[PDB]
Amino acid sequence: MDVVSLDKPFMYFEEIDNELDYEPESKLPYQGQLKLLLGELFFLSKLQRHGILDGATVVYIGSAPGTHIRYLRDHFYNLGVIIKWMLIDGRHHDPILNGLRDVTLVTRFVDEEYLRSIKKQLHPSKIILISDVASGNEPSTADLLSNYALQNVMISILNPVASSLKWRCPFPDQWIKDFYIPHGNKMLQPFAPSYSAEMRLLSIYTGENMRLTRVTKSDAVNYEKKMYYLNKIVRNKVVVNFDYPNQEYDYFHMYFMLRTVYCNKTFPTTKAKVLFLQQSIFRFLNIP
Amino acid sequence: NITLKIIETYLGRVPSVNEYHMLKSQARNIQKITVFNKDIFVSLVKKNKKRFFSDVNTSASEIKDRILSYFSKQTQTYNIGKLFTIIELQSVLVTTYTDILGVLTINVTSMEELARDMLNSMNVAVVSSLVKNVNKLMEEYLRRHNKSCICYGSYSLYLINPNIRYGDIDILQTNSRTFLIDLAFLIKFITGNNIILSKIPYLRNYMVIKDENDNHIIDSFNIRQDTMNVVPKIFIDNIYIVDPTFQLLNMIKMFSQIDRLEDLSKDPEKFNARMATMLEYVRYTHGIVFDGKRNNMPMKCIIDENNRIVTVTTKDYFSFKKCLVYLDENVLSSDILDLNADTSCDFESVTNSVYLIHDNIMYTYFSNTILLSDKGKVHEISARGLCAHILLYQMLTSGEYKQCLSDLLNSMMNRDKIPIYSHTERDKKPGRHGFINIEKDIIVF
Ligand SMILES: Nc1ncnc2c1ncn2[C@@H]1O[C@H](COP(=O)(O)OP(=O)(O)OP(O)(O)=S)[C@@H](O)[C@H]1O
Ligand SMILES: Nc1ncnc2c1ncn2[C@@H]1O[C@H](COP(=O)(O)OP(=O)(O)OP(O)(O)=S)[C@@H](O)[C@H]1O
Ligand SMILES: [Ca+2]
Ligand SMILES: [Ca+2]
């Protein structure tokens, strides 16, 4: 009919092995919070796994309202991972983040000056950066470029050991000029909008070497086609060899993310663990 | 509504606008604190003092005041940050003290020569009394918390060989912080002296309690239930100890660290006893024969000094052709991400490294210095250390390791000392020195 069988979902952009010409003609409640929750839980779990999360200060820029962050915070807190959360945004965060000694809420728009300020304040704390900065229709290429310039500024000043940055390449037909972004893995996001080309650039820095790679209009053509193929073909399929209550691709993808998450409760099978985590997450986000 | 009355009672005054807003969400834990019977607690702490700290001369009255004083210091604290701290720490006592500290109140000598032989070939380089009390308390602790606290090092070997002398008791726990906070308070209340809990950056999930004068009291490494479940353990005297076989493996990896060899020369006798005890155990437990025969062990280790990666040809003993051992953990972590590998096996402080088998190549990190016998040449002491590091993984995953372990030990026999020409440095591990300062109402991580 329109089903498929896969060994695994596409975890990173580089894995997508096909393309389709985009076509200008191209659901869950709080699905945006679920998108961020899964991606960050995945990112932070990876850092926990490789030992960099331990004792770190997670600096989150553009985190408001940040309801989902209260879930991440309790998850790691209950695993006994010591973390200092610093949530920064021009706007206010959800009240459930208030009254917690390990989380600092800062309401203010970041600029170079401010970034330098908290770096002095946090030093010598190991810093983990997560950026979800925006700027109302679809952002212009000029706004996106301004955004990536700022994210680079964050990295260069804050000198984080690892980062997760919002990454959506300007569309081909709206190219301005080439620009640079940190070297890293471009993590695909389950539950992102139907035709979203947005992903999460994950980087683990090596000493004083900020690696910067150029993004070209040619790369833009590629981003648009690969993502269109993924959104149009792959994400619309039901995965038949995926033994789960919901065989939708997005749930299949989610499963490969949640299976990497640690839990002190012991389960018989990975499936039982992922099921528990999923319910726990949906329950928390008020998703049926 | 009821929240305000909770907060007002807790603070012993009427909540200012800011205070009601800030503490509003903690209303639940605060009530738990207020409702907690402070008399039974004073009783509990006293009972504890008599069984484990009788030699501490302080008034039962002196104890009571310290305690009641702490459970009411909110009524005199107006800084919101300090308040959040007091509430956090008080809750740990209210919710966990009874379960943690409350419960507390109800063939070798033959291998000695083999040990000297092995150690001599490697010899080529160049604290408050509260511990006596805390130590005795941990002896009982290990017995009442078999599932959440495991022992290793001296004490664990002392239980096997009473001749072993031990200065402290090394433990891994699934609840270090809660435990350390509870213990810190117990000591604070009995002693009256301000202890500080601190977290060390270059150690994984590590925390230590030091006294008013920075004297070491007790430390602990935190591990998740996953890790605790896979750590090779043995049941002895109603306590779990890390399998002496696994500890032997770590000792071998440990001698690769320059500092440790320097310790070996200062006092060779200290290590003979522990070495011998473990050798004994393995021979008896795994039927390992000690003939100077063991081939392919010291499996070729080639250093690429510029990229700081030691290649270990393992195709003789394992399914994976080789094992790339990184000396910089951040480089390993980044390279693993580049491989799109999301499920590297982590064992935290137990191995101080992740292990990944990808396209039949193992990727891992070595946390000790790598000794060199010559330019670009790995010293056989480090080669055994690297080999031992890989075997830890085999043990943690119920894989094959017996023959290799036999080969490893036998290769340590009848060896001529080889001088150390140089060594690699460990990678630097960034981070702040965190701490909890009870009397100052400060928590900084
Ligand atoms: N020290 C205490 N202070 C206040 N409430 C307590 C205390 N101990 C127990 N409780 C209360 O009694 C219940 C739990 O009893 P337990 O804490 O498990 O046993 P226990 O009386 O502390 O035994 P001890 O440790 O044998 S020596 C809960 O309702 C607690 O709130
Ligand atoms: N640098 C290291 N590398 C690998 N393993 C280590 C290292 N340091 C310690 N270990 C392991 O942890 C064990 C205990 O640490 P220790 O401090 O040596 O305990 P201990 O020798 O029993 O205590 P004392 O004061 O010397 S009696 C050692 O026997 C090793 O197996
Ligand atoms: Ca010890
Ligand atoms: Ca110790």
Short mmCIF file of C-alpha atoms in Angstrom, two decimals, chain A residues 11-12 14-15 42 46 48-52 54-57 77 79-84 95 98-102 121-126 161 183-185 202-207 211 256 259-260 262-266, chain B residues 21-23 25-26 81 84-85 88 174 177 199-201 203-207 222-226 229 329-334 336-348 354 428 430-433 443-445:
data_model
loop_
_atom_site.label_atom_id
_atom_site.label_comp_id
_atom_site.label_asym_id
_atom_site.label_seq_id
_atom_site.Cartn_x
_atom_site.Cartn_y
_atom_site.Cartn_z
CA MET A 11 19.26 9.78 12.51
CA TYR A 12 21.45 12.35 10.73
CA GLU A 14 24.14 12.68 6.01
CA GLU A 15 22.36 9.32 6.12
CA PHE A 42 18.78 12.73 22.94
CA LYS A 46 24.67 11.41 24.48
CA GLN A 48 25.82 11.89 29.74
CA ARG A 49 26.89 8.67 28.01
CA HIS A 50 30.24 10.08 26.97
CA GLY A 51 30.77 11.72 30.32
CA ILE A 52 30.63 15.39 29.44
CA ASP A 54 28.56 15.35 34.52
CA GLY A 55 28.87 18.60 36.46
CA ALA A 56 28.16 20.84 33.46
CA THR A 57 26.33 24.12 33.16
CA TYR A 77 18.10 15.13 38.45
CA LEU A 79 19.51 9.95 37.58
CA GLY A 80 21.69 11.84 40.03
CA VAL A 81 23.49 13.83 37.34
CA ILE A 82 24.69 17.13 38.72
CA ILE A 83 23.79 19.95 36.38
CA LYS A 84 23.38 23.69 36.52
CA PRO A 95 6.36 29.12 35.73
CA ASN A 98 10.56 28.76 38.89
CA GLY A 99 11.57 27.93 42.45
CA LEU A 100 14.33 25.49 41.48
CA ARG A 101 17.76 26.06 43.03
CA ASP A 102 19.55 24.39 40.11
CA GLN A 121 30.69 34.56 35.73
CA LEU A 122 30.46 30.86 34.86
CA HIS A 123 34.18 30.23 34.38
CA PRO A 124 35.72 27.75 35.02
CA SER A 125 32.44 25.81 34.66
CA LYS A 126 32.25 23.32 31.81
CA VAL A 161 32.52 21.51 25.35
CA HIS A 183 31.49 21.29 12.13
CA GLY A 184 29.03 18.77 13.53
CA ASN A 185 26.32 16.16 13.04
CA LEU A 202 25.37 18.73 17.35
CA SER A 203 29.03 19.42 18.06
CA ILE A 204 31.58 18.09 20.52
CA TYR A 205 34.56 20.43 20.50
CA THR A 206 38.19 19.35 20.47
CA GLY A 207 40.34 21.71 22.48
CA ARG A 211 36.07 23.87 13.18
CA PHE A 256 15.83 5.00 18.21
CA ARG A 259 16.40 3.74 23.37
CA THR A 260 19.63 5.63 24.10
CA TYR A 262 19.19 6.08 30.63
CA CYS A 263 16.63 5.13 33.26
CA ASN A 264 17.29 3.78 36.74
CA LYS A 265 14.12 1.69 36.60
CA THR A 266 14.95 -1.72 35.12
CA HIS B 21 6.26 33.74 44.73
CA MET B 22 9.69 32.07 44.92
CA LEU B 23 8.81 29.40 47.51
CA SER B 25 6.18 25.87 44.14
CA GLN B 26 8.11 24.16 46.96
CA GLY B 81 19.00 31.58 47.30
CA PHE B 84 16.25 27.36 48.42
CA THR B 85 19.41 25.65 49.70
CA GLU B 88 16.83 21.32 49.49
CA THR B 174 23.90 4.49 43.11
CA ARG B 177 25.05 12.59 46.93
CA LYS B 199 32.88 17.75 43.59
CA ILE B 200 36.08 17.09 41.62
CA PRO B 201 35.98 17.84 37.77
CA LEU B 203 36.85 12.47 38.33
CA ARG B 204 33.53 11.01 37.10
CA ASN B 205 30.50 11.57 39.31
CA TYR B 206 32.85 11.94 42.27
CA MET B 207 32.13 13.68 45.59
CA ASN B 222 28.19 7.63 41.74
CA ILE B 223 27.08 5.07 39.14
CA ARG B 224 23.70 4.33 37.60
CA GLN B 225 21.75 1.15 38.22
CA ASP B 226 22.80 -0.03 34.71
CA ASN B 229 24.10 -4.34 37.59
CA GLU B 329 38.46 11.75 25.63
CA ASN B 330 36.94 14.78 23.89
CA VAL B 331 38.59 13.70 20.63
CA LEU B 332 37.13 10.22 21.05
CA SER B 333 33.64 11.57 21.81
CA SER B 334 33.71 13.79 18.73
CA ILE B 336 32.40 8.63 17.69
CA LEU B 337 29.72 11.21 16.86
CA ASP B 338 31.30 11.55 13.39
CA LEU B 339 30.72 7.79 12.96
CA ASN B 340 27.03 8.37 13.72
CA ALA B 341 27.35 5.87 16.58
CA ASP B 342 24.80 6.52 19.35
CA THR B 343 25.14 3.46 21.56
CA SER B 344 28.71 3.28 22.88
CA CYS B 345 28.83 1.24 26.08
CA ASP B 346 29.58 3.48 29.07
CA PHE B 347 30.65 2.28 32.52
CA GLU B 348 31.46 5.64 34.12
CA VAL B 354 33.13 4.35 26.71
CA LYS B 428 43.05 18.08 30.74
CA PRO B 430 37.80 21.25 32.35
CA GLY B 431 35.24 22.10 34.98
CA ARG B 432 34.66 23.85 38.26
CA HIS B 433 35.36 22.50 41.75
CA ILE B 443 25.47 25.11 46.82
CA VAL B 444 27.69 25.87 43.80
CA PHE B 445 28.13 23.54 40.81
#
